[PDB]
Amino acid sequence: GAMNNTIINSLIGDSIKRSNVFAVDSQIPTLYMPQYISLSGVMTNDNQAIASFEIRDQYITALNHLVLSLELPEVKGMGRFGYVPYVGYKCINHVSISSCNGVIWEIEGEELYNNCINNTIALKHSGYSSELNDISIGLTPNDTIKEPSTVYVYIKTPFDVEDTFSSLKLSDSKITVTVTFNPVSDIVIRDSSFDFETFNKEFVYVPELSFIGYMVKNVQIKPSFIEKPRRVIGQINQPTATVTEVHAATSLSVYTKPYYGNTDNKFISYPGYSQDEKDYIDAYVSRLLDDLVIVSDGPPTGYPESAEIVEVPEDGIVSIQDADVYVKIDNVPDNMSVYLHTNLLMFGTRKNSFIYNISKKFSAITGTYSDATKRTIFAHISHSINIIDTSIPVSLWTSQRNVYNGDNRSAESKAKDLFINDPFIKGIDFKNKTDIISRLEVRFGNDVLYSENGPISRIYNELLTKSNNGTRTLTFNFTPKIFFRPTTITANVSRGKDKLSVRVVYSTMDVNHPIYYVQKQLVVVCNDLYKVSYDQGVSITKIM
Amino acid sequence: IKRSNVFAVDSQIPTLYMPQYISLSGVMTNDNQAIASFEIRDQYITALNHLVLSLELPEVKGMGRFGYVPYVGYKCINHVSISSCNGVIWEIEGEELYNNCINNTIALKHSGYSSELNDISIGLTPNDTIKEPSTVYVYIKTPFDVEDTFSSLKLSDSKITVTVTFNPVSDIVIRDSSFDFETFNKEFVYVPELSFIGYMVKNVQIKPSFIEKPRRVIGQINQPTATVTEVHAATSLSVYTKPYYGNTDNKFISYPGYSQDEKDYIDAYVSRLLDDLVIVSDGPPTGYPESAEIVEVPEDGIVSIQDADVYVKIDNVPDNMSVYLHTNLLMFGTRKNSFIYNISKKFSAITGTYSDATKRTIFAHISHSINIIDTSIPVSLWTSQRNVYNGDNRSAESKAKDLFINDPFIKGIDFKNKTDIISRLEVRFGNDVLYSENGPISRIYNELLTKSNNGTRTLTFNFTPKIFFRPTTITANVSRGKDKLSVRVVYSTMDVNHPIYYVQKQLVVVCNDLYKVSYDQGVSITKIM
Amino acid sequence: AMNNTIINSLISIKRSNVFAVDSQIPTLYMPQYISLSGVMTNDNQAIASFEIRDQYITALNHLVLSLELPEVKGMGRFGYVPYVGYKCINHVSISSCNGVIWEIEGEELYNNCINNTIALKHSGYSSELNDISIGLTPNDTIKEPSTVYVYIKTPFDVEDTFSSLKLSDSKITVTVTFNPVSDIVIRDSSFDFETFNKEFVYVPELSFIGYMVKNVQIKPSFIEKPRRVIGQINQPTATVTEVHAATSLSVYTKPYYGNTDNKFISYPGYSQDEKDYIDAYVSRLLDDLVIVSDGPPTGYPESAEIVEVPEDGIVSIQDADVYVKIDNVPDNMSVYLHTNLLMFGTRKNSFIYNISKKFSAITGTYSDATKRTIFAHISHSINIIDTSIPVSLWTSQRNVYNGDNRSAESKAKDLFINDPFIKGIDFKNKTDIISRLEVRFGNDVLYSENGPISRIYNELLTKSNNGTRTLTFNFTPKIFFRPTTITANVSRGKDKLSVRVVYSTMDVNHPIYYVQKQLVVVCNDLYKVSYDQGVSITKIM
Ligand SMILES: CO[C@H]1/C=C/O[C@@]2(C)Oc3c(C)c(O)c4c(O)c(c(/C=N/N5CCN(C6CCCC6)CC5)c(O)c4c3C2=O)NC(=O)/C(C)=C\C=C\[C@H](C)[C@H](O)[C@@H](C)[C@@H](O)[C@@H](C)[C@H](OC(C)=O)[C@@H]1C
Numbered sequence A: 001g002a003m004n005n006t007i008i009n010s011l012i013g014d015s016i017k018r019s020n021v022f023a024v025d026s027q028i029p030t031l032y033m034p035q036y037i038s039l040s041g042v043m044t045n046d047n048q049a050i051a052s053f054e055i056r057d058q059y060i061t062a063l064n065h066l067v068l069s070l071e072l073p074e075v076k077g078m079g080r081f082g083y084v085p086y087v088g089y090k091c092i093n094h095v096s097i098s099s100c101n102g103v104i105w106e107i108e109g110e111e112l113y114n115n116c117i118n119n120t121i122a123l124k125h126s127g128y129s130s131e132l133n134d135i136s137i138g139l140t141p142n143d144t145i146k147e148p149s150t151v152y153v154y155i156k157t158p159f160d161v162e163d164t165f166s167s168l169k170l171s172d173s174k175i176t177v178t179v180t181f182n183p184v185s186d187i188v189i190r191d192s193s194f195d196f197e198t199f200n201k202e203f204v205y206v207p208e209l210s211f212i213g214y215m216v217k218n219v220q221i222k223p224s225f226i227e228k229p230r231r232v233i234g235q236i237n238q239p240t241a242t243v244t245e246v247h248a249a250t251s252l253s254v255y256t257k258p259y260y261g262n263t264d265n266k267f268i269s270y271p272g273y274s275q276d277e278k279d280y281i282d283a284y285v286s287r288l289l290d291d292l293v294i295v296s297d298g299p300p301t302g303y304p305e306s307a308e309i310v311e312v313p314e315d316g317i318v319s320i321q322d323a324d325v326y327v328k329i330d331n332v333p334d335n336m337s338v339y340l341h342t343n344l345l346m347f348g349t350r351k352n353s354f355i356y357n358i359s360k361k362f363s364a365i366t367g368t369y370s371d372a373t374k375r376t377i378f379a380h381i382s383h384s385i386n387i388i389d390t391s392i393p394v395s396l397w398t399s400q401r402n403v404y405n406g407d408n409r410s411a412e413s414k415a416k417d418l419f420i421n422d423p424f425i426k427g428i429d430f431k432n433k434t435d436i437i438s439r440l441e442v443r444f445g446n447d448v449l450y451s452e453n454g455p456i457s458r459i460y461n462e463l464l465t466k467s468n469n470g471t472r473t474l475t476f477n478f479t480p481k482i483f484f485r486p487t488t489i490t491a492n493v494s495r496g497k498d499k500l501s502v503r504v505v506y507s508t509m510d511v512n513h514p515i516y517y518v519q520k521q522l523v524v525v526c527n528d529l530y531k532v533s534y535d536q537g538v539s540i541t542k543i544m
Numbered sequence B: 001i002k003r004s005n006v007f008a009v010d011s012q013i014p015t016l017y018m019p020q021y022i023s024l025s026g027v028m029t030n031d032n033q034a035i036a037s038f039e040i041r042d043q044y045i046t047a048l049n050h051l052v053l054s055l056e057l058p059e060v061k062g063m064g065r066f067g068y069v070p071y072v073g074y075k076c077i078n079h080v081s082i083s084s085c086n087g088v089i090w091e092i093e094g095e096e097l098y099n100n101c102i103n104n105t106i107a108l109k110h111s112g113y114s115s116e117l118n119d120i121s122i123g124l125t126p127n128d129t130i131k132e133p134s135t136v137y138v139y140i141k142t143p144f145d146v147e148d149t150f151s152s153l154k155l156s157d158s159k160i161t162v163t164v165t166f167n168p169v170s171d172i173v174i175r176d177s178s179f180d181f182e183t184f185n186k187e188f189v190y191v192p193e194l195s196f197i198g199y200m201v202k203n204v205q206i207k208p209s210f211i212e213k214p215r216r217v218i219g220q221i222n223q224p225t226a227t228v229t230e231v232h233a234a235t236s237l238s239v240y241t242k243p244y245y246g247n248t249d250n251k252f253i254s255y256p257g258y259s260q261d262e263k264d265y266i267d268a269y270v271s272r273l274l275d276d277l278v279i280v281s282d283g284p285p286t287g288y289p290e291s292a293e294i295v296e297v298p299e300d301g302i303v304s305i306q307d308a309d310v311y312v313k314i315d316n317v318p319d320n321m322s323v324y325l326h327t328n329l330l331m332f333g334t335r336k337n338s339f340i341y342n343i344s345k346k347f348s349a350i351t352g353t354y355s356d357a358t359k360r361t362i363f364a365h366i367s368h369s370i371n372i373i374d375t376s377i378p379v380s381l382w383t384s385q386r387n388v389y390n391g392d393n394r395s396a397e398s399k400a401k402d403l404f405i406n407d408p409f410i411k412g413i414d415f416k417n418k419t420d421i422i423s424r425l426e427v428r429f430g431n432d433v434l435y436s437e438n439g440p441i442s443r444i445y446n447e448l449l450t451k452s453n454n455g456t457r458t459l460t461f462n463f464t465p466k467i468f469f470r471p472t473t474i475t476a477n478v479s480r481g482k483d484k485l486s487v488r489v490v491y492s493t494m495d496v497n498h499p500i501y502y503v504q505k506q507l508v509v510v511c512n513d514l515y516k517v518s519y520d521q522g523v524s525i526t527k528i529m
Numbered sequence C: 001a002m003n004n005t006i007i008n009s010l011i012s013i014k015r016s017n018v019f020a021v022d023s024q025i026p027t028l029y030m031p032q033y034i035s036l037s038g039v040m041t042n043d044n045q046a047i048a049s050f051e052i053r054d055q056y057i058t059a060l061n062h063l064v065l066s067l068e069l070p071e072v073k074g075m076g077r078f079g080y081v082p083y084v085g086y087k088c089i090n091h092v093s094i095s096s097c098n099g100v101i102w103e104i105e106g107e108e109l110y111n112n113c114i115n116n117t118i119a120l121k122h123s124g125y126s127s128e129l130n131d132i133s134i135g136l137t138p139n140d141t142i143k144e145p146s147t148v149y150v151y152i153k154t155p156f157d158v159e160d161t162f163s164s165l166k167l168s169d170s171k172i173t174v175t176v177t178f179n180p181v182s183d184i185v186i187r188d189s190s191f192d193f194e195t196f197n198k199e200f201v202y203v204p205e206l207s208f209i210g211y212m213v214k215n216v217q218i219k220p221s222f223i224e225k226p227r228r229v230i231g232q233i234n235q236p237t238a239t240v241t242e243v244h245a246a247t248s249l250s251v252y253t254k255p256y257y258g259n260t261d262n263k264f265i266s267y268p269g270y271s272q273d274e275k276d277y278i279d280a281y282v283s284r285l286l287d288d289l290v291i292v293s294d295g296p297p298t299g300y301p302e303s304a305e306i307v308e309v310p311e312d313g314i315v316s317i318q319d320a321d322v323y324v325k326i327d328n329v330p331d332n333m334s335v336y337l338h339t340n341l342l343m344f345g346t347r348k349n350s351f352i353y354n355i356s357k358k359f360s361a362i363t364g365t366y367s368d369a370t371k372r373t374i375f376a377h378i379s380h381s382i383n384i385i386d387t388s389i390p391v392s393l394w395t396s397q398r399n400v401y402n403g404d405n406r407s408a409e410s411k412a413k414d415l416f417i418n419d420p421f422i423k424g425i426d427f428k429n430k431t432d433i434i435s436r437l438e439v440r441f442g443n444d445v446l447y448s449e450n451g452p453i454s455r456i457y458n459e460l461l462t463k464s465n466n467g468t469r470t471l472t473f474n475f476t477p478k479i480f481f482r483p484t485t486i487t488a489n490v491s492r493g494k495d496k497l498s499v500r501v502v503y504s505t506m507d508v509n510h511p512i513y514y515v516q517k518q519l520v521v522v523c524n525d526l527y528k529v530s531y532d533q534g535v536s537i538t539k540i541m
Helices: A005-011 A087-091 A109-115 A120-125 A196-202 A277-292 A411-415 A456-464 B072-076 B094-101 B105-110 B181-187 B262-277 B396-400 B441-449 C004-010 C084-088 C106-113 C117-122 C193-199 C274-289 C408-412 C453-461
Strands: A032-040 A042-044 A050-055 A062-072 A079-083 A092-099 A102-108 A136-138 A144-146 A149-155 A175-181 A188-190 A207-216 A224-233 A240-244 A248-259 A293-296 A309-311 A317-320 A323-330 A337-341 A362-370 A375-383 A437-444 A447-452 A472-475 A499-506 A519-533 A539-542 B017-025 B027-029 B035-040 B047-057 B064-068 B077-084 B087-093 B121-123 B129-131 B134-140 B160-166 B173-175 B192-201 B209-218 B225-229 B233-244 B278-281 B294-296 B302-305 B308-315 B322-326 B347-355 B360-368 B422-429 B432-437 B457-460 B484-491 B504-518 B524-527 C029-037 C039-041 C046-052 C059-069 C076-080 C089-096 C099-105 C133-135 C141-143 C146-152 C172-178 C185-187 C204-213 C221-230 C237-240 C245-256 C290-293 C306-308 C314-317 C320-327 C334-338 C359-367 C372-380 C434-441 C444-449 C469-472 C497-503 C516-530 C536-539
Touching: A005 B017, A005 B192, A005 C444, A032 A050, A032 B432, A032 B441, A032 C004, A050 A207, A062 A087, A062 A175, A062 B441, A079 A144, A087 A092, A087 A109, A087 A149, A092 A109, A092 A149, A102 A109, A102 A224, A102 A539, A109 A224, A120 A149, A120 B441, A136 A144, A149 B441, A175 A207, A188 A196, A207 B441, A207 C004, A224 A240, A224 A248, A240 A519, A248 A437, A248 A499, A277 A293, A277 A337, A277 A362, A277 A375, A277 A411, A293 A323, A293 A362, A293 A375, A323 A337, A437 A472, A447 A456, A447 A472, A447 C029, A456 A472, A456 C029, A456 C059, A456 C117, A456 C146, A456 C204, A499 A519, B017 B035, B017 C444, B017 C453, B035 B192, B047 B072, B047 B160, B047 C453, B064 B129, B072 B077, B072 B094, B072 B134, B077 B094, B077 B134, B087 B094, B087 B209, B087 B524, B094 B209, B105 B134, B105 C453, B121 B129, B134 C453, B160 B192, B173 B181, B192 C453, B209 B225, B209 B233, B225 B504, B233 B422, B233 B484, B262 B278, B262 B322, B262 B347, B262 B360, B262 B396, B278 B308, B278 B347, B278 B360, B308 B322, B422 B457, B432 B441, B432 B457, B432 C004, B441 B457, B484 B504, C029 C046, C046 C204, C059 C084, C059 C172, C076 C141, C084 C089, C084 C106, C084 C146, C089 C106, C089 C146, C099 C106, C099 C221, C099 C536, C106 C221, C117 C146, C133 C141, C172 C204, C185 C193, C221 C237, C221 C245, C237 C516, C245 C434, C245 C497, C274 C290, C274 C334, C274 C359, C274 C372, C274 C408, C290 C320, C290 C359, C290 C372, C320 C334, C434 C469, C444 C453, C444 C469, C453 C469, C497 C516
Parallel strands: A323 A362, B308 B347, C320 C359
Antiparallel strands: A032 A207, A042 A050, A050 A175, A062 A149, A062 A207, A079 A136, A079 A188, A092 A102, A092 A175, A224 A519, A240 A499, A248 A472, A248 A519, A293 A337, A309 A337, A317 A323, A362 A375, A437 A447, A437 A499, A519 A539, B017 B192, B027 B035, B035 B160, B047 B134, B047 B192, B064 B121, B064 B173, B077 B087, B077 B160, B209 B504, B225 B484, B233 B457, B233 B504, B278 B322, B294 B322, B302 B308, B347 B360, B422 B432, B422 B484, B504 B524, C029 C204, C039 C046, C046 C172, C059 C146, C059 C204, C076 C133, C076 C185, C089 C099, C089 C172, C221 C516, C237 C497, C245 C469, C245 C516, C290 C334, C306 C334, C314 C320, C359 C372, C434 C444, C434 C497, C516 C536
């Protein structure tokens, strides 16, 4: 019939005991009923915004999947304004889940975001749209820059790992969820024209905590284990950080963070919603091109005396030292000539030494002059502009270290600069592309626990977690979560093996390049093992 | 201390079986709805799962614009029924099968998602090939696939009949007026083939199982209520809206083809409007209705349509010709002195260059505020009775390029289902409120828990693992009248002078009822009560 | 707060605890990421040997091969193939003192990782590596040095610690055989490949997750070992002998470019979509297709038929009409179309495969500043096959015409592509050239299909967009169960799998007809892992 005769004869024609692979006994589970519960908080104000949510109900036996709502207000007025990508996560400074017995679980804003970086849905929900993240311009004092919106922040906790099995049980105890918010300055990208002073005064965080509550008939509570993260931020430009009292750790993550305290946090360009490396680069090239190639009737005006604008010769090639720039613009009027800004942005430590000129990073600029709009429409640009260039704060171009003026752009271009205060920036560039760690050494006391010359620990992290944006992580727990006691790195207090000392070898950069002056901070995250006890309320105990 | 072996495991000998991919040709039957019946009866086919329906799409020859809807294979399905001699074992509505597969990129690609199928192709001669023949594969996801061999549909020497009801070819096709649909609808025939993974099991040990059967109730047009009766044991409840285009001719100004992003829909619309929006002509433009207000662009480039300023600057315009802006391309107004929804006002800057060689304007950059809703407005609503103005002030050429879209699985009020029109949801078990929300938090949980970007407002009752456990259901009380689920929605208030306000809405409520699979004297299902 | 309707609904039968679980103490162990430098050995194939023997290392899994790609300096066009790290691999073999435990062919390891986006990205998929870079001076940097990571997916990773390869105080040798650097590199004639091939050396490093296990309790396990059979060139048959217990059988086709110089007109670089391949081809052809010149164009062969575009704009190449209209053309110059850019035919007065006929409309604007044509919109019928035709076939002895009527400038821009993992007859493996598939277990027919339904099931069951015609026999969960296999009957002759395909035939006047095909049949055989006196495998028969 339908089955092939070769198969029928292979089977039809018994002694050995076999496991039933075609049927299973449908086990009756614990009688329960779930419900999505949303709660309004209590706002408190260094005058940091803190939201407190109290969960106390006889029928809320267990809970998991915490989602924080945030009502973003209508933004009216003049100037350029936009929210940072995944705005909802960037709002969060700290989250604490505590009971009468103390803190059960807590996370720093950046660590919660890092744990959700692989979750596209959670990231989209937190605020990733052209409506929120593109930089909008307000023309009149009553013009709407941003329409009001609601964002949803998934607060991933260890209670979600195995759904109902991992859920936080409530032993007739009061659970308080505390959310500490970062200043609105962090989540906003704006220009000088925008009235931030008024905005910061008028802005208020409007949060609402949602969770999946479970009403369990005759609950049989058993003790569980929980991994609690603990971060350590090293001193400015120090290649070392130490995590004290490490007794039972499931993982250790190492990454870098830039420090922009020495700057005004202003940047030349921002790509808006489009977040690819190419998008960041293109946004920068587009901003520079306005001043880089000028079609004018006589030498261009409105630029500093320090600026050296050169007329493009008949051959099209302009020679800036060793660098040759080919500039050819079509439909240029007979009364006008093509000009090139040979030193748009320049840096140097000594008056007659090596110079880093952004105009030298261009090799070919082709376009057509529009008689109707009286502007140059660029066709193709050949350049060597990188993600680092786009990530250089404006302050460093005009820094005291620089012997030259630095910023030779027009006043128009300078006015379009945007303040970026994103709290979750990693590495030294906006895309965290440049790996500035040449070598990583992890020491458990005096002994060397781990060492690497390549980011193989990041490769394993990215592979094992199926993430495209991982960190140099040392996982100690390869045992299945919830159903087993996690495997940890056991300490030896007597031998001085109760600390994790991380040492890195930062890459050596050129002093005549502005990124050299971007202050660095080594972030070391340690996940400590704790035991959840439900005897006379919920409580946690550090495994030692 | 006693420790569990985490580095080694005893390799259990499984049930002796042999799988085989079996493909069957059906029996076609013809309201003259196309129905395909597939009979599965073999002593050696002990169990089956992973149903895949193949469809041989024919060569499309002739004149006019033609293209298939994205995921054409899923859109073909109106209903699927898996039945035995004891009756229906499992059944699903076309849209619900598609909804269950929306997160499966592979299944969606297989069903027909290509530039070859979905881009709108134009036929120039009556014998010109518009679309080349193709075969699409529709994965009919069933609860028998959840845990592979463990969840498989067992055949107790019983006849299993797979019945596939097909939607009319009108639903899966996007065409213009020039296309001879009358002939196509007559000539078109569904050519199906059902494939499945069959298992020959030596000494099968069948045990009873549980199955979730989806039930849907579609509310009346513009009625914000729907009720699912005889709810005794439900595992979930999904709530969504569907647009109803009966009050229209199902014609739309633009369609982006294969490129399905929100931006792609918007760009396709802007491109279609631009042909009539900015005109380079020798004297005032002709071929437009008297109702049209085409204004010559002044020297400064700014044309003022009320409070809205439109900057229009076209290069290489001949000395004998002038640049013109259509100030009321598409307009809507309920009353003569009320708010006006003007599509030309949705543009702020239009720059381009006139080509002397092709005698046409090549647009460079467009600054506009056009949205996904604009692209989703049926042409009929612009020329609606409620509109005191003419409405459609486009050229006869532009109007002839309009496409009929009859996609049966459209949700919300826009083509991308972006706009959430439910302001408040209220679910009642019997008479008592089971759940209520002011925000789409149930949709957020659905999208998060299922790792889907296109979820619905879903109330999940079962958070217990499937197949290995009896699903956690909402327990009913007949005596208290708690034997039904009533859904009441409050729609988001829109301004009356916007054309989309007149899109008829339909509330869809899906209930997953729990059934017990019994294998005593053939396969049979029993509703848990 | 909980709703009153829920509280009233809840407030004898045995129930499984779904809200709590006993946290079982696992086997005491400690993991460590261990990286090892190899031993390089050298038609004169590069082989890297990695020896794993340590008292602490009890078990291992997740093999990752690191490769140090050197700085590429000099003149000419150069770029690496996408997923360069996987393409480097010819063979991988994990062996003990008792012999080979597990081994895979380079292409099969890549096929097993094609659904893993992360593993593919790590192996080298960037604009920095895969876009074709041009070197202007002999000391100009074409490619900056980079490190690529190749995830060698093994059956020991399936269930993490449970599936891990245990080392019974035995020496485990990981042997990696490398394909020639010619395979992983896309370059032009201007590039000094001769020097590069001499100077290039594979710099590998094997990383793995080692486990130090206190009081390990080793139990025997099962392993699926792949076997590949490549049929004779263009032959629609291949047989895999000694098939006693197989879990699956995959069937696919590969092109053979031995009859060519492996040179191709265009390559899209990093952008790998079908449209990207097509656009890169159109862009390369357009330079010679539409010429703006002062009088008839020069620098083309005598065989070229360059026609001046009439006032009408339409140029008629036989039945095919090409509309060409270029703006801002100088008064002294005219618009010209190359009516036979690439042509193929087997007879002097028969059907022609002309590439110029594959164009219907070409619009653009002439730039006075750069003295070149800037194309705006192109209407064409160019396909993935056209882009996949090797240059040799256009100039082949089968062709009555000259074939390649492009300029010397265009011909110099041709790139050598030697990617070892190309499937089908096109670069995107779009064209399905198998009309029918027949699989025989011994002399009896096991499976037959007229459509690629086995490929559809493979793509669906593995959640992959790039699958093959696969016959899976094991639908039982891995590691926790003995896999389900086709059972042989040596006495009845049923101890081999014979695959017979029916290839759809191409048009003899179309250059792709002369692209050689190869049938590839992959069989996964079941083996038992024994740990008694070292690690050893035994074929299930
Ligand atoms: C993290 O989850 C684990 C929980 C551990 O803790 C502990 C104590 O809690 C558990 C649950 C809460 C379970 O619900 C559970 C199962 O439902 C289950 C098995 C199955 N395991 N074995 C056990 C021995 N038997 C038998 C013994 C003698 C002859 C054969 C065979 C099956 C199991 O052990 C379970 C289990 C535990 O062991 N499924 C079956 O019974 C079955 C009908 C088929 C199984 C098919 C696959 C093989 C299996 O799905 C595989 C893909 C894995 O995914 C799981 C094993 C999973 O492990 C990992 C790792 O993934 C565990 C559920």
